Amino acid sequence: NSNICEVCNKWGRLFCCDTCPRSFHEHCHIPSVEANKNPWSCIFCRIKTIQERCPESQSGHQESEVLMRQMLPEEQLKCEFLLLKVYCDSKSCFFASEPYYNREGSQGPQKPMWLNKVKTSLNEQMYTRVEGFVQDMRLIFHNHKEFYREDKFTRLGIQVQDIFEKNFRNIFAIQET
Ligand SMILES: NCc1nc(-c2ccccc2)no1
Ligand SMILES: [Zn+2]
Ligand SMILES: [Zn+2]
């Protein structure tokens, strides 16, 4: 297995997948690595299994249909995976914890949002449809863009949002256009 965390690329107390060579810190994996006995498969493998069992799930979908899906176990899993893919990017650090807003000539957003809050909302099964999860994720980057305006720091929001949207389109097999 790998000797660094798949998500944050650091060594430490790592948990190894049994069906692939990836390794994870306990709380870098989403969901947090399960304490159940042998064996254990990481979310990459579990997502791969889903895709393989239903090859046609890779055909193109409309975003509108995807967003209205109820958060049944497989949809819950896909959102956990999509969230993890965002954490995999180092620039996710800027969006992980609770933000604060005190900048000359800017007012903070009406509804602050950050990745650890979305992670907790997923863990506590607070989203009933995919739409709720996607809206909170997109809110993170929209808040950032509105607040920093013309400061070049706005680009971080654009970069991490691009990561989110590419993985959304891939994981949920959105029709190519
Ligand atoms: N291109 C690599 C690849 N994508 C998939 C996939 C299967 C079902 C739904 C979404 C994606 N499987 O392999
Ligand atoms: Zn890690
Ligand atoms: Zn694995």
Author numbering: 701 to 877
Publication text:
In the case of the PHD-BRD tandem domain of SP100C, we have identified a novel binding site using SiteMap, and identified two fragments that bind at this position by performing a X-ray fragment screening campaign at the Diamond synchrotron light source. This crystallographic evidence validates the predictions made by SiteMap in the case of SP100C. Although the binding affinity of these compounds was not determined, they were clearly present in the crystal structure and surprisingly no fragments were found bound at the single-domain BRD or PHD pockets. Oxadiazole **1** binds deeper into the pocket than aniline **2**. It exploits hydrophobic interactions with surrounding residues. Oxadiazole **1** is positioned to form a hydrogen bond with the backbone carbonyl of residue I871 via its primary amine ([Fig fig8]). It also induces a conformational change in residue Q751 not observed for aniline **2**. The primary amide of Q751 is rotated through 120° relative to the uncomplexed structure. A comparison of the binding mode of the two identified fragments shows that oxadiazole **1** binds deeply into the pocket predicted by SiteMap, with aniline **2** occupying a hydrophobic site at the mouth of the pocket. This arrangement of these hits suggests that a fragment linking strategy could lead to optimized ligands ([Fig fig8]).
